[PDB]
Design a protein around this ligand. Sequence first.
Ligand SMILES: [Mg+2]
Ligand SMILES: [Mg+2]
Ligand SMILES: [Mg+2]
Ligand SMILES: [Mg+2]
Ligand SMILES: [Mg+2]
Ligand SMILES: [Mg+2]
Length: 117
Amino acid sequence: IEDALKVVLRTSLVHDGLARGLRESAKALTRGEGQLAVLVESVTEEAISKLVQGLATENVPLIKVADAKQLGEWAGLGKIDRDGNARKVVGASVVVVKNWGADTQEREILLEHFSQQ
RNA sequence: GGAUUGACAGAUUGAGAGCUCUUUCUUGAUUUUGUGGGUGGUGGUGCAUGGCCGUUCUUAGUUGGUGGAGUGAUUUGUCUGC
Ligand SMILES: [Mg+2]
Ligand SMILES: [Mg+2]
Ligand SMILES: [Mg+2]
Ligand SMILES: [Mg+2]
Ligand SMILES: [Mg+2]
Ligand SMILES: [Mg+2]
């Protein structure tokens, strides 16, 4: 569901858990750091997503949310001073959650479900 | 899918300065380039100013209130003496 994703992104934004990008994401996945990964399939030439898959194959669970620009928007990359979006364009190709921070029950049931697949 | 940051080694440099280049690696929204604006300045103006000090002046000199004289600026009080 949509709720657990925003909850986990908030809990990793406040405690610096988001590997906002792909190089930091790749380094976190290579290390014992990246506990979750959200990436978009609407990526040109698709090789970055394939490389990410590989990173998660070796810290396993991944999420397949679309709308890269929207993904960055609700990923907290924006300063979002006003109520509405105050920046033209901002987005993230890959988001990696390292620090689980605060825990909510619905989100943990969701991550167990996505682990079960 | 990199605003950016930093650097081993060499050219360069006086430098063991990643100042600049060769290559590449690191770093994550603090930044970078433009506008407004702001700071910093033993920059200018002591002939824009404050404060302070110096000097006129180490002398004994100043001042206003009622009163008198002048239309008045001013004067007497602040003086002939000792
Ligand atoms: Mg100065
Ligand atoms: Mg100077
Ligand atoms: Mg003067
Ligand atoms: Mg005097
Ligand atoms: Mg009089
Ligand atoms: Mg007199």
